[PDB]
Symmetry: C2
Subunit: 350 residues, 2 copies
């Protein structure tokens, strides 16, 4: 069997009658599918366990994911190879804890509430990739470090210190958060992983054989930022939000790095500084995207590559050749140093 | 009144008789102190709520913190100004959920277990400072960004890429984690906050008026690393673990920075790059610690300052004067570039 456990938040106020009505329908349908489980609610949070044959469970879960009456859905546990039903008598038992007043329940309710509030806050400070691992039955704190080949992505905002000195603090933070949201959505869609924010820079990585997807993410980010600049409100600082991107490939160490108070599951190795140094080169070029020959040679599609005969990196073992993509964007960009001048003059007047 | 809620982990296996024995004693003592509450256990995790007069609660809690039968104690909620008792009949009610088999309890137990396992894992990926705020009744996700004066601390491991290429991956990670633990313990003891790990670098900050404490942390870190080098086992890579430290002071923005998938409560501003650039200068000097004139001039004790007439920073508005502390360590260090040579030759033979 399969057994799923998830929690979610009310999308809107729901009465006890409305909740009982959801239970009735759930029971009617689960009974037909030979599915059992329990549904609990407390102070605007749903908890549910559902168990049955795998295909049927996936179908039910897809409908539940589409239900507009809850949101912020998070699967806490996905058990496959289940051997015995936990609630064999219950097609769907509904337990509204708001309305319960039993003796021993009362202290458990309070503990359940306090832990849930805490857990839903921590979710926002922790990586989604960590939760997936937990829900698959693995404790990520016990994963051993390993050497692995990756593509490292590094981006940073051009002349950001100008923002921080000409605008109110709420507006500065609003710009960086918009930049970080744009990058995360695209990188995640292309199969990559944002692993660290560093001031105004984004560090992310892709599998060692995904150069195509890292290149595609980079071009889509740059295109998304152009669209944002041209459609921003009059006087918006987003009109002068520009980025540079660098990509490198190499063997890195992946694992739990940190102290006893706080760790991250992240990567370590020379490819990280190489991507950082490449990203910094975009400040002296019209190209907003540069990447190493190792990335270029690992790609499998016929990209419009251009070889930049200006490889003047530092801290490189034996120097590396540098490439970019030649597209309309790059040919119609006025150069990194002139853009920093343009940012100052514009923000000095908003 | 005051009401405390905490969770903890069994330090060792405990029988149901042993647990009931803890309850008996708790009841006897809480009754004398006019304290009430509840104690629950499940699968080796304690949960407790205790409520009463504030001074008495603090005293009870200090004894509980010293009890060697549980560990990993975390306060989830500290309520002051409480108006009504939650458990007025219960000096200390003990509820052993392992032994419970009531109808409606069973599903709640399962949900409580799953959330607790998840919560105790996320704790290790999130900053302790976040939990303190939550336990005081504030949701940190709703704190507004603010401009504030801070001391920024930046440290990094000398010639780390040599470690990563000469040693097995488990040993590389073990070294960086030891470095990060040494720094965190000292910085936290001096009232500072480690906010980010970046590859092999530590970023931390202190209040704007705590230059003395940031300087003291820096000297204690360097002294702790020397002691570690000289007492490491024969052939240990820790014998060639060296660090550089840079400190700067300025106005930064503090708040929630990130995307919708993941944010950090951290800082942003020019003082961060200034401390980074200062830290990098230690690679060309015998000094392992350098800091800006703003830090020097903000300190209130009579430190053995030395003015370094070599201020050749880049990206600085109008250049800055650079200082260090002249002590035995610095005068008996053979210089940054010779140390990187020494690290390679030693690790090439372990
Ligand atoms: C908290 C919550 C839990 C739900 N649990 C179930 C369930 O266990 N089984 C089910 O078939 N539908 C469940 N639903 C409802 C489905 O989302 C969907 O409305 C229903 O399956 C559609 O049935 P219908 O096509 O007959 O109207 C749940 C909805 C909510 C908000
Ligand atoms: C989970 C756990 C919960 C406890 N709760 C209480 C409590 O509520 N009140 C109390 O006085 N001692 C409590 N204790 C025990 C104290 O740690 C300590 O042993 C006791 O107060 C000492 O009493 P004594 O000096 O009479 O031996 C608890 C211990 C554990 C492991
Ligand atoms: N610009 C960067 N941004 C983020 N992480 C970086 C950056 N540069 C390096 N790292 C990380 O730090 C690790 C160590 O690189 P670093 O630049 O500190 O070199 P090093 O060999 O330690 O020499 P140094 O003596 O200059 O500190 C790298 O493996 C990478 O994981
Ligand atoms: N070495 C660094 N390590 C960590 N964070 C840094 C570092 N340098 C800068 N930052 C953070 O990034 C923010 C932006 O600094 P950055 O170096 O990107 O300057 P900038 O004005 O954006 O110019 P550029 O066009 O060179 O990117 C700084 O305010 C600081 O918060
Ligand atoms: Mg920048
Ligand atoms: Mg930057
Ligand atoms: Mg280093
Ligand atoms: Mg480094």
């Amino acid at each position: 069997m399969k057994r799923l456990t998830y929690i979610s938040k009310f999308s809107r106020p729901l009465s006890g009658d409305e909740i009982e009505a959801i239970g009735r329908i759930s029971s009617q349908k689960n009974q037909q599918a030979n599915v059992t489980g329990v549904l609990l609610c407390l102070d605007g949070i749903f908890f549910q366990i559902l168990e049955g044959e795998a295909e049927k469970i996936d179908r039910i879960y897809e409908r539940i994911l589409a239900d507009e009456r809850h949101t912020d859905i998070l699967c806490l546990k996905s058990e496959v190879e289940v051997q015995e039903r936990m609630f064999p008598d219950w097609s769907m038992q509904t337990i509204n804890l708001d309305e319960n007043t039993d003796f021993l329940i009362r202290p458990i309710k309070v503990l359940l509430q306090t832990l849930t509030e805490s857990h839903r806050i921590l979710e926002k400070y922790t990586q989604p990739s960590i939760f997936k691992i937990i829900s698959q039955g693995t404790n990520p704190l016990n994963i051993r470090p390993k050497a692995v080949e990756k593509i490292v992505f590094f981006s940073d905002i051009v002349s950001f210190s100008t923002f921080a000195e000409k605008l109110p603090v709420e507006e500065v933070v609003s710009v960086v958060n918009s930049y970080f949201s744009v990058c995360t959505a695209i990188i995640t869609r292309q199969g990559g992983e944002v692993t660290k924010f560093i001031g105004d820079c984004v560090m992310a990585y892709f599998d060692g054989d995904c150069a195509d997807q890292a290149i595609q993410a980079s071009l889509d980010i740059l295109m998304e930022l152009e669209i944002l600049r041209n459609s921003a409100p009059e006087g918006s600082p987003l009109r002068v939000l520009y980025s540079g991107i660098g990509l490198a490939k190499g063997k890195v160490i992946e694992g739990n790095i940190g102290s006893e108070l706080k760790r991250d599951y992240t990567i370590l190795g020379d490819a990280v500084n190489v991507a950082a140094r490449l990203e910094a080169l975009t400040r002296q070029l019209s190209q907003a995207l540069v990447f190493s020959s190792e990335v270029k040679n690992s790609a499998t599609k016929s990209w419009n590559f251009i070889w930049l005969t200006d490889s003047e990196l530092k801290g490189k073992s034996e120097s590396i050749d540098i490439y970019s993509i030649d597209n309309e964007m790059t040919r119609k960009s006025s150069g990194g140093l002139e853009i920093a001048r343009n940012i100052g003059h514009y923000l000095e007047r908003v």
